[PDB]
């Protein structure tokens, strides 16, 4: 899922060139092939990600 | 060389990026809004119940000289109506 | 103004992003127009029925 509520398949196809994985969730970073999306988004140790 | 800055903001101390979003029905149609850190500079995240008062500071060329006590008016640029001020006219006095 | 009792609020229904301009209003404070721009991101969440 992207922050535009639009559902993107193949999380790596989302252009995410980086992925930091936490203890209780999986998240993807530097998501290039995403469209503008990303209205408010969020995160802490890092900024913005899908 | 004298300006004002709202307390607790840094022009480029923090880094993030460019964004785009759409806001509808809270305006004064669907107009796209682009946020860039270059001009707006920093984004402050306020919780569900938090209120904020942007106390402003007067800066001379080399440093801040005093806290502005004058009346100031606040309004978001794009044009909305959802924001409101908690105090009323009577509580302030009129 | 400072020492005033009023703080701007935002609806609690959803999280929103706003970019605010602020302008000093006192006519006899300074000669040219003092102005600043900042931004506020809110965080209202709507509970499941
Ligand atoms: C609008 O909301 C703000 C809250 O963000 C109100 O400011 C707060 O006002 C209350 C009282 O109305 C303050 O509580 C008490 O104030 C006395 C003042 O001497 C202090 O001694 C107490 O320890 C206690 O703090 C509160 O301090 C104040 N907020 C802050 C950050 O100082 C404001 O009053 C609201 N508007 C109206 C019209 O009430
Ligand atoms: C991918 O994400 C990383 C962090 O998640 C970004 O990190 C920067 O990488 C460049 C390499 O060219 C470094 O020079 C910067 O110092 C890094 N930034 C920080 C804060 O350490 C990276 O920018 C992202 N990729 C792109 C293309 O933006
Ligand atoms: C008003 C305020 O807190 N300003 C801070 C400053 O003190 C700090 O040195 C800088 C770091 O780059 O970030 C900003």
From Swiss-Prot, chain A:
Residues 1-35 form the Kazal-like domain. Disulfide bonds join 1-33. Glycans are attached at residue 30. It is found in: Cell projection, Cilium, Flagellum membrane. Coiled coil: none annotated. Component of the CatSper complex or CatSpermasome composed of the core pore-forming members CATSPER1, CATSPER2, CATSPER3 and CATSPER4 as well as auxiliary members CATSPERB, CATSPERG2, CATSPERD, CATSPERE, CATSPERZ, C2CD6/CATSPERT, SLCO6C1, TMEM249, TMEM262 and EFCAB9. HSPA1 may be an additional auxiliary complex member. The core complex members CATSPER1, CATSPER2, CATSPER3 and CATSPER4 form a heterotetrameric channel. Auxiliary component of the CatSper complex, a complex involved in sperm cell hyperactivation. Belongs to the organo anion transporter (TC 2.A.60) family. This is Solute carrier organic anion transporter family member 6C1. It comes from Mus musculus. The gene is Slco6c1.
From Swiss-Prot, chain C:
It is found in: Cell projection, Cilium, Flagellum membrane. It comes from the Eukaryota. Glycans are attached at residues 1, 28, 33. Coiled coil: none annotated. Auxiliary component of the CatSper complex, a complex involved in sperm cell hyperactivation. Sperm cell hyperactivation is needed for sperm motility which is essential late in the preparation of sperm for fertilization. Component of the CatSper complex or CatSpermasome composed of the core pore-forming members CATSPER1, CATSPER2, CATSPER3 and CATSPER4 as well as auxiliary members CATSPERB, CATSPERG2, CATSPERD, CATSPERE, CATSPERZ, C2CD6/CATSPERT, SLCO6C1, TMEM249, TMEM262 and EFCAB9. HSPA1 may be an additional auxiliary complex member. The core complex members CATSPER1, CATSPER2, CATSPER3 and CATSPER4 form a heterotetrameric channel. This is Cation channel sperm-associated auxiliary subunit epsilon. It comes from Mus musculus (Mouse). The chain holds residues 888 to 936 of 985 of the full protein.
